[PDB]
Scaffold this active site. Structure first.
Site, short mmCIF file in Angstrom:
data_model
loop_
_atom_site.label_atom_id
_atom_site.label_comp_id
_atom_site.label_asym_id
_atom_site.label_seq_id
_atom_site.Cartn_x
_atom_site.Cartn_y
_atom_site.Cartn_z
N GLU A 1 37.75 55.82 49.13
CA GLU A 1 38.14 55.77 47.89
C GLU A 1 37.67 56.58 47.04
O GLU A 1 36.28 57.31 47.72
CB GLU A 1 37.92 54.27 47.20
CG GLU A 1 36.51 53.95 46.99
CD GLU A 1 36.27 52.46 46.64
OE1 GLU A 1 36.70 51.92 45.55
OE2 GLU A 1 35.50 51.90 47.50
N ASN B 1 43.81 45.04 47.60
CA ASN B 1 42.46 45.17 48.20
C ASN B 1 41.53 43.89 47.79
O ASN B 1 41.67 43.45 46.70
CB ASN B 1 41.80 46.20 47.53
CG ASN B 1 40.30 46.54 47.95
OD1 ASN B 1 40.30 46.96 49.12
ND2 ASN B 1 39.47 46.42 47.19
N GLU B 2 40.95 43.40 49.10
CA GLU B 2 40.15 42.20 48.89
C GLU B 2 40.83 41.24 48.26
O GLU B 2 40.03 40.45 47.01
CB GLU B 2 38.75 42.72 48.34
CG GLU B 2 37.89 43.78 49.34
CD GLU B 2 36.66 43.67 49.04
OE1 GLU B 2 36.22 43.50 48.08
OE2 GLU B 2 35.82 44.10 50.12
#
Ligand SMILES: *[C@@H]1O[C@H](CO)[C@@H](O[C@@H]2O[C@H](CO)[C@@H](O[C@@H]3O[C@H](CO[C@H]4O[C@H](CO)[C@@H](O)[C@H](O[C@H]5O[C@H](CO)[C@@H](O)[C@H](O)[C@@H]5O)[C@@H]4O)[C@@H](O)[C@H](O[C@H]4O[C@H](CO)[C@@H](O)[C@H](O)[C@@H]4O)[C@@H]3O)[C@H](O)[C@H]2NC(C)=O)[C@H](O)[C@H]1NC(C)=O
Ligand SMILES: *[C@@H]1O[C@H](CO)[C@@H](O[C@@H]2O[C@H](CO)[C@@H](O[C@@H]3O[C@H](CO)[C@@H](O)[C@H](O[C@H]4O[C@H](CO)[C@@H](O)[C@H](O)[C@@H]4O[C@H]4O[C@H](CO)[C@@H](O)[C@H](O)[C@@H]4O)[C@@H]3O)[C@H](O)[C@H]2NC(C)=O)[C@H](O)[C@H]1NC(C)=O
Ligand SMILES: *[C@@H]1O[C@H](CO)[C@@H](O[C@@H]2O[C@H](CO)[C@@H](O)[C@H](O)[C@H]2NC(C)=O)[C@H](O)[C@H]1NC(C)=O
Ligand SMILES: *[C@@H]1O[C@H](CO)[C@@H](O[C@@H]2O[C@H](CO)[C@@H](O)[C@H](O)[C@H]2NC(C)=O)[C@H](O)[C@H]1NC(C)=O
Length: 627
Positions: A23, A350-351
């Site tokens: 990222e 994400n997560e």
């Protein structure tokens, strides 16, 4: 300890086992892998008429600078302009500098591409040269080029000029500049927008990547690249999420966004630049899609998801679709790449373990839609495995762990007790980050690692031997974060660090490279390491050649000997190669000592029986041929 090697493989080692996690964090994209040299190049996502809007920009001489909401912007995606004025009563060079991302490397063997847009907001009789170039920060010109402009140019106009420095600079304390003659220019105002300065790029790709960093990533032998996040996918709010389409096409049409690490992303590093890098390196993507959650805690309601589900379909069609069948695929073709790119894996969010109350419906609605459009893609869930229970049944989960070096060797059997029920696992982020178990995310003074150490790399390597043993179900694994600009850091430790001029390969980078470049397609069972012990190993074989890779992690403070027994085999080579990464427990590669800890390669005697003394805190690879 005696390590007996079975001649019969138990399973195939996936091609995807080792790869990278990306990222834009620590200026890993803007300021890092993306080759652009100018910081705040197009005034994206800043507030006019503030000091922060002028970040990285400085006057030369008596220039007056202000960032304005332009009444007539270069593009509506780039609403801000630099307003440059020369006072009456002037002479000599007058203009402005950009300091880069904490410097600019000026190398005599490089051709640079400079560009900008300008207009005179009020027509004038100005007539003179516009000069662009590179200077030392003390003000001495290292390279320049110019073109004649006129004050009657009231339409936005692009300037494109190459630079050839007269000398390499002694350091990176250099700036890009734009000047006019202050006597010719006295009393003038010019509006500027959309600046850019590029060095030569990896594979000479337009709008491409910084060569030393790109080459370093390729050096590691990665098989996949997980992107674009990570937290930087999510946004703080729905409106600040990553959006694929804002990252494609002309830079004039890319608005940029505030990312999740304190800085503006230009989105110059966009979907096609990522995909071209994969093509250029032989990596395949693990591509994330935004899934209805952002980091301020808001989940979209179920009845709000449909447009975001379609945006994720559009994103995937850009990558793989037939150009004749969708607008995003036609767009990929229009941009010069009509062939589809490889895409086997898509990660949903994400997560989402942080938003597990909504993930069941978000996962259900996204994957039902996306799998029906793309029956051949494997979708990866991001909640904790099996809690909550998802529908459809996930084929894969992404597991993240940040822990102490000791935890990593102690947990090398993490996957051994998992069921073999068709599910595969992606260790999409891991790193040994601190020696303080109770404050892992704290400061360096409280045990956080500023850079990977021998200790952290060796603990990671012990855990990786377990990933490899369990690679019947573990299909992919990546350290995180990948990259760090040492002058603008939000997270440590990181795999590869750099400043404007040079790269630092960490201890952990060498462990990752040793594992990835010395990996067969067959897993050869062996005597098991002690569960909880410091000494671990994993053995693989290349089916085509018989090259056999014995990877050994000694994550503890005492040397240990291993007696390898390969007597089950028909033949074993009489010699092998040895590669060893070792040093003091807390040693690191740093900007001051960037090659303090590097692997050593040798040849040794082997055969059906041989002995290796594994130093304290070491990662070793012994390669022999077997049949
Ligand atoms: C492949 O094999 C794996 C391993 O067996 C299967 O995983 C199991 O999946 C089921 C769901 O399909 C999970 O069931 C839920 O269990 C929770 C209770 O969880 C607690 O107790 C579990 C023992 O029963 C224990 O395993 C859990 O431990 C996990 O979580 C903790 C931290 O939370 C961690 O410390 C452990 O490491 C584990 O990660 C935990 O302590 C239960 O509350 C759920 O009930 C709800 O859902 C059901 C079904 O919808 C519903 O009927 C109930 O009414 C309720 O609403 C549910 O039973 C089980 O936890 C999973 N086991 C593990 C070890 O992860 C997997 O399903 C297999 N997949 C395939 C494709 O076959
Ligand atoms: C990247 O792609 C995403 C999509 O995947 C883009 O996000 C979408 O953006 C569109 C356009 O902003 C947006 O659709 C609008 O939703 C608005 C808010 O509800 C509506 O008001 C609006 O309808 C008007 O505009 C349409 C033309 O866009 C008309 O056809 C319609 O009749 C409405 O017309 C009224 O309003 C307009 C001014 O907007 C005016 O000219 C008319 O006269 C009339 O008064 C749109 O339907 C989506 O909701 C966004 N979707 C998502 C998922 O975010 C994103 O913008 C792209 N990024 C970049 C940089 O391009
Ligand atoms: C100033 O910039 C121009 C434009 O980039 C340079 O001219 C290009 O030079 C390359 C190398 O010779 C040619 O291949 C291009 O065809 C040229 N383009 C144009 C529009 O002329 C020029 O070399 C630069 N001059 C200096 C002193 O750096
Ligand atoms: C970017 O970071 C580098 C690396 O930390 C900085 O260079 C160090 O600066 C200190 C303090 O001036 C010196 O004692 C070190 O010897 C430097 N190290 C190296 C390897 O040169 C650099 O100053 C930073 N740049 C900016 C612009 O802040």
């Amino acid at each position: 300890v005696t390590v007996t090697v079975n001649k019969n493989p138990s399973h195939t080692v996936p091609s995807t086992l080792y790869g990278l996690m990306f990222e834009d964090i620590n200026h890993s994209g803007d300021g890092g892998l993306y080759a652009e040299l100018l910081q705040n190049r197009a005034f994206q996502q800043v507030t006019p008429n503030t000091a922060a809007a002028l970040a990285a920009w400085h006057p030369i001489s008596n220039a007056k600078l202000a960032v304005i909401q332009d009444p007539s912007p270069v593009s509506n995606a780039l609403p801000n302009s630099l307003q440059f004025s020369v006072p009456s009563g002037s002479s000599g060079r007058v203009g402005f500098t950009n300091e880069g991302f904490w410097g600019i490397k000026v190398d005599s063997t490089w051709t640079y591409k400079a560009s900008l847009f300008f207009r005179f907001p009020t027509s004038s009789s100005f007539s003179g040269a516009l000069t662009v170039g590179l200077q030392t920060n003390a003000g001495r010109v290292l390279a320049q080029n110019s073109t004649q402009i006129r004050g009657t140019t009231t339409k936005w106009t692009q300037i494109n000029l190459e630079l050839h420095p007269t000398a390499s600079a002694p350091d990176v304390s250099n700036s890009f500049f734009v000047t006019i003659d202050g006597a010719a220019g006295a009393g003038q105002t010019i509006n500027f927008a959309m600046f850019s300065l590029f060095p030569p790029t990896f594979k000479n790709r337009p709008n491409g990547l910084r060569a030393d960093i790109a080459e370093t990533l390729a050096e590691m032998g990665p098989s996949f690249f997980r992107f674009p996040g990570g937290n930087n996918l999510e946004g703080q709010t729905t409106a600040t999420r990553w959006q694929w389409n804002a990252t494609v096409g002309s830079l004039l049409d890319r608005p940029g966004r505030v990312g999740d690490w304190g800085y503006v992303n230009t989105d110059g590093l966009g979907l096609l630049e990522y995909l071209q890098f994969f093509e250029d390196t032989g990596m395949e993507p693990i591509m994330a899609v935004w899934a209805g959650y952002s980091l301020g805690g808001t989940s979209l309601a179920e009845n709000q998801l449909a447009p975001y589900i379609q945006q994720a379909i559009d994103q995937i069609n850009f990558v793989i679709g037939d150009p004749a069948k969708s607008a995003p695929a036609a767009l990929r073709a229009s941009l010069g790449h009509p062939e589809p790119f490889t895409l086997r894996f898509v990660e949903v969010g994400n997560e989402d373990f942080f938003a597990a109350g909504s993930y069941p419906y978000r996962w259900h609605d996204f994957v039902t839609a996306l799998q029906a459009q793309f029956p051949q893609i494997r979708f990866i869930a991001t909640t904790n495995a099996w809690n909550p229970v998802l529908s459809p049944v996930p084929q894969s989960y992404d597991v993240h762990v940040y822990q102490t070096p000791t935890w990593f060797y102690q947990n090398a059997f993490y996957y051994d007790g998992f069921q073999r029920n068709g599910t595969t696992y992606f260790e999409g982020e891991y790193a040994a980050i601190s020696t303080n178990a109770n404050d892992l995310f704290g400061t360096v003074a409280d045990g956080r690692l500023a850079f990977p150490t021998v200790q952290s790399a060796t603990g990671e390597a012990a855990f990786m031997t377990g990933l490899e043993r369990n690679s019947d179900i573990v299909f992919a694994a990546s350290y995180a974060p990948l990259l760090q600009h040492v002058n603008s850091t939000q997270w440590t430790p990181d795999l590869v660090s750099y400043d404007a001029g040079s790269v630092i390969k960490s201890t952990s980078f060498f462990a990752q490279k040793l594992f990835a470049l010395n990996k067969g397609d067959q897993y050869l069972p062996s005597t098991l390491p002690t569960n909880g012990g410091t000494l671990h190993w994993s053995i693989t074989r290349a089916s085509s050649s018989g090259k056999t890779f014995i990877k050994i992690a000694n994550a503890g403070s005492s040397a240990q000997s291993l007696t390898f027994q390969l007597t089950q085999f028909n033949s074993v080579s009489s010699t092998g190669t040895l590669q060893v990464l070792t040093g003091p427990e807390t040693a690191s590669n740093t900007p001051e000592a960037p090659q303090a800890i590097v692997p050593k390669t040798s040849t040794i005697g082997t055969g059906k029986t041989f002995t290796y003394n594994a130093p304290a805190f070491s990662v070793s690879v012994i390669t022999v041929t077997t049949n």
